[PDB]
């Protein structure tokens, strides 16, 4: 089955998630002003599925239980399957200008699937019959998994195992007759407060010192032991205030991160993807990796669309918007957006069947693709700042543009004087003007400036991680045989 | 006479300025958690020139009154003072890491100077007396005067006189035969709530139909029928948290803007400085800015200095600070910082004396300072970004890092577990890391952002307005004759 | 029947066509050093077609002739055809690692294909079939067909019909019952001097009142009327110098332009594809400049290969390989090169099938593939020169290298100086050193830096010429609706 | 006294200066097509110093002799010294869009001037009473000296004494009672073949197993052992052909580059500056090196303003003059020109005396200086590009121009159709819109190519060289503790 939105929400609140934000419990989280944007976001991904204008780019008939399911579930059977994930996600990008979230359960279980495999072939083990088996339960019970790969990483001068603190990444500490027992955290996972489930695997490449760090598995979201600390978002707490809305900038959507814990969580043996085979969890880091930095290409395009739009809005709104380098900036974000689009379809359309038989992008163009990323959101910001004007960040609240306080000489209000001076062409209402300027502040400084800017900087990697694969994969020294043959060298 | 930072604060004490927030009368303003950073800003400009170590450049003997002022409200006498005025604010960035206001009543000051007596020389008036004494009063009261220029404008593509609404640029309503009454408002406007006086000046060059807009004067902060709406910014109410502290990232420092609004104010003549004569709208603008984009070249460098200094830090308590990568990124936001800096110091050394006798900065390269400004602080944020790591903008509030409540297996709490796995290299706590993650969250993203990223692209004019004037400045025709020269054309 | 590489050459020796170089008819042109690196260099696309192990990508079945044919000549079936000829181009320029020219012979057939369909479909004419014969010629005799779009064009401020002389684009002079006659030029054509045919088409939109421009048609080289004059390349004469190798970079290949003259010229009704219908003008420009902006994703892509590849061997033969900011920068030229391919890849894998049955680019995609290519080769060259050092622009000449003439105080050569004082790390004798170095320079600044460099700048258009055309492609009224459903607006 | 051009040309035709080219000696190289241009250009430095309109800007009273003097010979007695010199390089590179050399002496003269002083206040050597002696000697005779600095250095990666021929560094081979016997070459010198002595230094700092290798003195060009060997240029033969002059682009200047080699070269005691104290060469390296990083800061903006013409010039002959992009393409190359020029500026306005006396410049803002110059020249050439368009590099030759050869059915000559084809505004004839093109070709791509693009990249250092001594000057640990302070932290 597919859940509509609404049965999306209503199996949240049966769950026993334990959530925690500024020292105390949060009872009702589902409801909660600081956490529900991020519901409404992932919520999205279930409604466009209900919609049949949207069905067939949302929904597939599964290959391993032979019913429709949605895209966000299937394992890639193409490099045209590869091509329409990246659609999917420039719609919902276009949708809910965030991070909508569930594409890492998506990639995580293409690479778990794919990884589980090759790790069976050397050890004669079972963990792709345990990925495939809960699989199958995922796509019938259509339900959110959180992929967590993240770490907190402790000092980054040094390995898993020479850390003062063995629990600064996730390991196994005990092994018993039914299952193991594990203990650490994941840090920086957006929606993980809003999911059924997590699947885990490692952060980075592992030797044989570091092989109880080499763990993947996963588990509910109220699994015994296991628990969540919210982490902030700048302009947070706009949400709380009475009436918040102009002034969100995204009232229905947003995306949250938070720290998850694992108190010394079990888990049974048929829930176990990877437990010690060090040589296996580079694979697992280079593979989810790589569909997460594809993904980019689809999501951050969606949502520059949305800034795109906005900024050329803006211009209308202002009266600006015959002026040349008005348009001319417009045409620049445009085109560095479309670059980033390329870059996602390329490695897609270049992708390639792996052992286990689903399909994989180039690894090469999903690191370009990423690389880029790092980049053209910042700019793609500063333009929609220049166009935009001063007044988005330094307009008074929304409580002061509808106040009926009295200021004037002659019974003017504070709201009669915001309305009146922040007027500007006659194509909109003085509110609808705010409005949009709200929208471009919240993305270009607040709450959603966190995915757009600092996600796109650090997701799937820090700029680093790219650069050096990228000189591994690039070929360097067929490149240097090809200038010898023109030059006339031996 | 100088006061010190105790006596300017209790100066503001005295004052009867209506300031609104919310929708409310704001009684104890100086004492208001989201405008006191403001006050405490400004405030350095007085600590330091009681500091014996830095006497020398932050006062000067008054060369109308004889006395030791503030070189805030000193006129330039030569290219060594345009020099001295960039390294003064260079210090003041350092020390702060914010805006402290007060550079715009120094700039105003000169600009009025010099342009005032140019139209008396022209139309018989008294403008030029009427400054030179209030500029008097000032400097023997060492008093705070907000310079505000910019108005709402209404419909960018209309001229003053244009406008559906006459309002939305600043204008004479009524002229007396013992002074003029004003209506309008001034946007954008930073530490004008914590101002003794404001000077206001148009913001674009005037025709004849709109001589009503050609209006500068001085008035104090609490005269009849002025009052000012806050702007929000970033993160605000994070200061309104109880025992708000690591989570601002600055808690002492902040600068704060507003609209000011003039409700029919009445200027007497002795204050006004421009009456209707519209040729010289354009000469103040060109003035004002000129020195401002000047200030840029000082106050932008010295706030970069502390940027560059807090990722270099947070590479330290991560344990990445051997890295190449790392210490070239420190090195590129080192080099754009100096780049700016020097068109800063540049404008000034090719300085000159106007007609009235104060030194002014080369209109050109105050041009390139400023357009240079419009691009390389948002791309030494960027970088401290990728230096700093995810944290930055997912780290759980203090309060649960402070926490005592009970969470873990065996008693830990919510402040136990945030310590623990938030922990990095020896070389800090793990609340010393917090504290540099979290200034950096509120420079690229939070409060200060608004400054160091937004202002620096629109205060004093938006990066067009630089293009129009170096085109104009350029001197291309008698460079087509270079050409011609060379390329052996007649 | 396909062409051996020497087969092609002695084709060209029976032809008649006029070439003129400094003022003298050149009578052995295919011998000709200035000219015979363009005739080696188009050579390879019929040797590499003949090798097997490239003869999968080389060849393809043609569906109009039933018989294999060079992919140089084929009208497109898929998007999988569109991304073969992208990798085809990749191929032929790591091979020469300049213009192999043929390029504009196949998009020009594909874009007149489509075209005349269209014109037919909407006038009752018969262009379509006055072009499927004359491709038939073409596939059957393995010919290579100039494309010839860009006229000299008079002054920029201008339209055709509007200038002072009526010559400065290509027109009908003269209508008969047999055929027509027309008058003027084309400018810039790549490989015309050794091509078998043209294939003539106007430059840019047409209205009503310019309507004897709007004409295309195709020709033999040496058509009674028509010749060329060469046009000069940077270091072009270093081809002239007794035994020319070292100092040339790049001594087999090159790719030379020239001044293609129309002076009344008979064209037969058959050979006709345009004659007067301006509103198609307009379609055929953007036809076959998308299939070339389409093309650079590939050929510039395997030149730049054979860039970063040499400054690569650069380091490794200066022996400054290990340092950490020259494998950054090897990095960079590889990021960058690799973004253009993903450009070229992706605008063929979005493509779709025309009326007229073939497939075309994603028109977007393609204008964003070319617009990056005005700016990453200059980047890539920039970096290169960094990594090769000051030897690529101050070597002395070949001639000093080998010179016997003895200049040391004990019997020492110029050449024994050259050989000893320009050595570097054993990897390589001083000669190999000497021979990347002049291929840097070459490319960099030389005879290839006309191609890299400027043809990347202009080629199928100045960049602004994209710059228009994104706008109106880029979706931006559907943009703004999607931020106002974001923003609470209706 | 001071010479004039015409005396300056006369003096070299009496050096018996040894120089070869493509095998062979030249004996009268001062006529030579590929050398006089660089010294026409060198040439210009002694005729605006005849010059009423210039001569004080371009020369100076000596505190040496007490005589008047050339600029260029100067020791800086202030911060205007170090300004003017700067505006006087603005002035030179505006007359010769060229290099024109003679900067090399100045920077020398003073970096061994105020190093030789604290070589003998610690070893109590003659070094600083030798040069006096030796500056005295030029400033009388108004002579060239031309700089030497860089060695060829063979392996990269390996000290002078680790080398495997231990001449590829210039060293001592012997020392005598009376002098000192040397032996090895320096590379890339340019002007070398047209001074009148040339002044060596070491090239960077030296430990004691390299103190054979710290060596500086003076010595006439045509000193027994010493000869030159040319060095190529792109397109420099054009230069012999027979009446060259539109297809040079500069006709009248140039600056060429020769290997000038040590065959065993005797120097007397007086003429020898420093002799195997190594703790100071890095001194010497530091101090020419910073004046000439300064030198670029006033010689590239001068060059960039011929540009910029060249450019704007181009669009008035094609017709494309009001075009709001190409308005806009000539703002950016301005502004990244003076962003240049305020670099210069500003590490002049911020010099200081050495303990010798002289004046020195910021030596972190000339690394600035430097750091932007390896940058900008390289886009305001593409910017440059762009706007002449593809006739710039396809245009045939001067001969082709002037042809008398029949081609056209009308008796038309080759001449006729190059002027009638390539004619474009009313502004210009063809022949003027060819020379502004042929300029603009020569300095992206040809002989002027090598000096604006390539010797700023690697002209006083390659990039990486600055970039290590910024991170030294940066004092990033005392930024650290600025933001300790202001994040709260002890
Ligand atoms: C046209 C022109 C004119 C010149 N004129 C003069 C002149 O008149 N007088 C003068 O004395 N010099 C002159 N120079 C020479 C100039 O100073 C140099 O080119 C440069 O300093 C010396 O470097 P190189 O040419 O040996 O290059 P290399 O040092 O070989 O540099 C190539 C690259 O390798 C890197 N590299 C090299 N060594 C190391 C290392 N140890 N560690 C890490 N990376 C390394 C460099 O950073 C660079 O990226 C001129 C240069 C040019 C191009
Ligand atoms: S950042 Fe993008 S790809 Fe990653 S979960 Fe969010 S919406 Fe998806
Ligand atoms: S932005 Fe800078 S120059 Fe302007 S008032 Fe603030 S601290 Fe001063
Ligand atoms: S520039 Fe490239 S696409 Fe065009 S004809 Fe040459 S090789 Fe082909
Ligand atoms: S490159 Fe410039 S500073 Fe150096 S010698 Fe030439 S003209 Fe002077």
Known sequence: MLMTAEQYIESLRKLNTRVYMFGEKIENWVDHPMIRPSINCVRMTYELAQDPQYADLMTTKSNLIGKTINRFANLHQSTDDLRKKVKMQRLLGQKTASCFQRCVGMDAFNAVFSTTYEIDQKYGTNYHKNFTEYLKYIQENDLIVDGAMTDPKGDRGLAPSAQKDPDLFLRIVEKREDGIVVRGAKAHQTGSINSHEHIIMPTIAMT???????????????????????????????????????????????????????????????????????????????????????????????????????????????????????????????????????????????????????????????????????????????????????????????????????????????????????????????????????????????????????????????????????????????????????????
């Not at 993904?295 to 739009?309: L, M, P, Q, R, W």
């Not at 211009?315 to 600006?320: H, I, M, P, T």
């Open 208 to 490: 044989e010192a570091d092989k109880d760090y080499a763990v993947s598995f996963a588990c509910p979201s109220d699994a015994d032991g296991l628990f969540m600390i919210y982490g902030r978002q700048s302009c947070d707490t706009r949400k709380m205030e009475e009436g918040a809305d102009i002034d969100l900038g995204n009232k229905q959507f947003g995306g949250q991160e938070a720290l998850v814990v694992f108190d010394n969580v079990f888990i049974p043996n048929d829930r176990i993807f990877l437990c010690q085979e060090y040589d296996f969890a580079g694979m697992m880091v280079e593979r989810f990796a790589g569909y997460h930095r594809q993904s980019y290409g689809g999501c951050k395009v969606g949502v520059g669309d949305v800034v795109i739009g906005a900024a050329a809005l803006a211009a209308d709104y202002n009266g600006a918007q015959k002026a040349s380098h008005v348009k001319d900036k417009l045409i620049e974000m445009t085109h560095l957006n479309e670059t980033l689009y390329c870059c996602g379809i390329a490695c897609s359309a270049e992708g390639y069947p792996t052992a286990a038989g689903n399909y994989q992008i180039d690894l090469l163009l999903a690191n370009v693709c990423k690389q880029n990323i790092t980049r053209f959101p910042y700019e793609i910001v500063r333009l929609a700042e220049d166009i935009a004007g001063g007044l988005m960040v330094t307009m008074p609240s929304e409580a002061d543009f509808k106040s009926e306080t009295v200021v004037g000489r002659d019974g003017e209000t504070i709201g009669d004087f915001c309305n009146k001076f922040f007027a500007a062409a006659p194509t909109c209402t003085t509110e609808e003007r705010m409005r949009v300027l709200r929208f471009l502040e919240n993305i270009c400084l607040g709450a959603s400036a966190v995915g757009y800017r600092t996600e796109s900087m650090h997701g799937a990697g820090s700029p680093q991680a790219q650069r050096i694969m990228i000189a591994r994969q690039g070929n360097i020294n067929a490149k240097k045989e090809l200038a010898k043959a023109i030059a006339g060298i031996k």
